[PDB]
Enzyme design. Structure first.
Site, PDB file in Angstrom:
ATOM      1  N   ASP A  25      46.988  21.253  31.438  1.00 43.18           N
ATOM      2  CA  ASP A  25      46.963  19.843  31.822  1.00 43.18           C
ATOM      3  C   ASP A  25      46.201  19.673  33.134  1.00 43.18           C
ATOM      4  OD1 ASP A  25      47.344  17.199  32.285  1.00 43.18           O
ATOM      5  OD2 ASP A  25      49.533  17.235  32.088  1.00 43.18           O
ATOM      6  N   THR A  26      44.962  19.190  33.034  1.00 39.22           N
ATOM      7  CA  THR A  26      44.156  18.906  34.215  1.00 39.22           C
ATOM      8  C   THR A  26      44.659  17.697  34.994  1.00 39.22           C
ATOM      9  OG1 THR A  26      42.609  17.563  32.920  1.00 39.22           O
ATOM     10  CG2 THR A  26      42.136  19.916  33.125  1.00 39.22           C
ATOM     11  N   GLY A  27      45.539  16.886  34.412  1.00 36.50           N
ATOM     12  CA  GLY A  27      46.101  15.743  35.094  1.00 36.50           C
ATOM     13  C   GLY A  27      47.332  16.030  35.924  1.00 36.50           C
TER      14      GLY A  27
HETATM   15  C1  LIG Z   1      49.970   9.556  34.246  1.00 39.25           C
HETATM   16  C2  LIG Z   1      50.803  10.823  34.668  1.00 39.25           C
HETATM   17  C3  LIG Z   1      49.822  11.924  35.246  1.00 39.25           C
HETATM   18  C4  LIG Z   1      49.102  11.418  36.531  1.00 39.25           C
HETATM   19  C5  LIG Z   1      50.107  10.967  37.605  1.00 39.25           C
HETATM   20  C6  LIG Z   1      50.623  13.249  35.563  1.00 39.25           C
HETATM   21  N1  LIG Z   1      51.235  13.800  34.337  1.00 39.25           N
HETATM   22  C7  LIG Z   1      50.449  14.823  33.576  1.00 39.25           C
HETATM   23  C8  LIG Z   1      49.936  14.183  32.293  1.00 39.25           C
HETATM   24  O1  LIG Z   1      48.993  15.037  31.672  1.00 39.25           O
HETATM   25  C9  LIG Z   1      51.088  13.916  31.327  1.00 39.25           C
HETATM   26  C10 LIG Z   1      51.679  15.213  30.779  1.00 39.25           C
HETATM   27  C11 LIG Z   1      52.735  14.847  29.646  1.00 39.25           C
HETATM   28  C12 LIG Z   1      52.408  15.117  28.171  1.00 39.25           C
HETATM   29  C13 LIG Z   1      53.438  14.761  27.076  1.00 39.25           C
HETATM   30  C14 LIG Z   1      54.788  14.140  27.464  1.00 39.25           C
HETATM   31  C15 LIG Z   1      55.114  13.872  28.942  1.00 39.25           C
HETATM   32  C16 LIG Z   1      54.086  14.227  30.035  1.00 39.25           C
HETATM   33  N2  LIG Z   1      50.520  13.187  30.172  1.00 39.25           N
HETATM   34  C17 LIG Z   1      50.806  11.745  29.912  1.00 39.25           C
HETATM   35  O2  LIG Z   1      51.585  11.120  30.573  1.00 39.25           O
HETATM   36  O3  LIG Z   1      50.108  11.171  28.826  1.00 39.25           O
HETATM   37  C18 LIG Z   1      50.615   9.888  28.237  1.00 39.25           C
HETATM   38  C19 LIG Z   1      49.346   9.076  27.808  1.00 39.25           C
HETATM   39  O4  LIG Z   1      48.916   9.715  26.667  1.00 39.25           O
HETATM   40  C20 LIG Z   1      50.180  10.148  25.988  1.00 39.25           C
HETATM   41  O5  LIG Z   1      50.131  11.580  25.561  1.00 39.25           O
HETATM   42  C21 LIG Z   1      50.998  12.275  26.386  1.00 39.25           C
HETATM   43  C22 LIG Z   1      51.975  11.214  26.987  1.00 39.25           C
HETATM   44  C23 LIG Z   1      51.289  10.058  27.090  1.00 39.25           C
HETATM   45  S1  LIG Z   1      52.971  14.064  34.412  1.00 39.25           S
HETATM   46  O6  LIG Z   1      53.482  14.773  33.229  1.00 39.25           O
HETATM   47  O7  LIG Z   1      53.734  12.781  34.417  1.00 39.25           O
HETATM   48  C24 LIG Z   1      53.240  15.027  35.991  1.00 39.25           C
HETATM   49  C25 LIG Z   1      53.764  14.300  37.225  1.00 39.25           C
HETATM   50  C26 LIG Z   1      53.970  15.083  38.528  1.00 39.25           C
HETATM   51  C27 LIG Z   1      53.638  16.588  38.570  1.00 39.25           C
HETATM   52  C28 LIG Z   1      53.834  17.380  39.852  1.00 39.25           C
HETATM   53  C29 LIG Z   1      54.741  18.596  39.548  1.00 39.25           C
HETATM   54  O8  LIG Z   1      52.597  17.804  40.288  1.00 39.25           O
HETATM   55  C30 LIG Z   1      53.097  17.316  37.317  1.00 39.25           C
HETATM   56  C31 LIG Z   1      52.892  16.546  36.031  1.00 39.25           C
END
Ligand SMILES: CCC(CC)CN(C[C@@H](O)[C@H](Cc1ccccc1)NC(=O)O[C@H]1CO[C@H]2OCC[C@H]21)S(=O)(=O)c1ccc([C@@H](C)O)cc1
Lengths: 99, 99
Positions: A25-27
């Site tokens: 996860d690059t995000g």
């Molecule tokens: C906008 C949030 C991002 C930017 C602030 C950050 N996020 C990573 C992002 O890749 C998430 C990863 C994810 C994937 C599946 C289910 C839940 C989360 N993907 C995601 O929200 O995508 C949505 C849109 O598309 C849909 O598919 C997927 C779910 C839907 S995080 O998880 O919230 C997070 C927060 C803090 C930390 C600290 C430790 O550094 C690490 C990681």
């Protein structure tokens, strides 16, 4: 290897002597893993994304193997719906985005 | 280009005529942008993240330029903490992960 994004970039990892599937996860700045009883000292933390925050436990200097590439760094453990390999470890395995 | 991950993979996008900053997010199935005005029709939808589910406005077949590469796909608008480019558009510009 090269990982296309037609589907979720899920890969097998090894952490604390256990194999798991996790998202490259690059995000994500840092790595977040499903609830698990790791040994050692930790500190509580809140992390936020779409939908709000969850409470996690921060472990430092945790060894994780990702498709044979070893990495060591910070890992947050809590009730996340998916295991998330963040940039703090993606850099250690030499992962880049290419287009 | 080749993008390393020691910093957030932030890019300038062009959508609805205006420029914005967005995060290349391989852990996101979908593209989600903060509140904004977009032309065209939309339908209510729900999306879930690490913290839970939020209501968004789903715009389909939206033209969007990502660092000079054109894509036409679904854009969700809602209370996301960060503008994120998800896999639905990363595939259109030929993004892959490599290590
Ligand atoms: C906008 C949030 C991002 C930017 C602030 C950050 N996020 C990573 C992002 O890749 C998430 C990863 C994810 C994937 C599946 C289910 C839940 C989360 N993907 C995601 O929200 O995508 C949505 C849109 O598309 C849909 O598919 C997927 C779910 C839907 S995080 O998880 O919230 C997070 C927060 C803090 C930390 C600290 C430790 O550094 C690490 C990681």
């Amino acid at each position: 290897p090269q990982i296309t994004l037609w589907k979720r970039p899920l890969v097998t990892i090894k952490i604390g002597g256990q194999l798991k599937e996790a998202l490259l996860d690059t995000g994500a700045d840092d790595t977040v893993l499903e609830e698990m009883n790791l040994p050692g000292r930790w500190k509580p933390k809140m992390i936020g994304g779409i939908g709000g925050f969850i409470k996690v436990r921060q472990y430092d200097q945790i060894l994780i193997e990702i498709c044979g590439h070893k990495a060591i760094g910070t890992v947050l453990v809590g009730p996340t719906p998916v295991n998330i390999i963040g940039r703090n470890l993606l850099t250690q395995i030499g992962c880049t985005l290419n287009f």
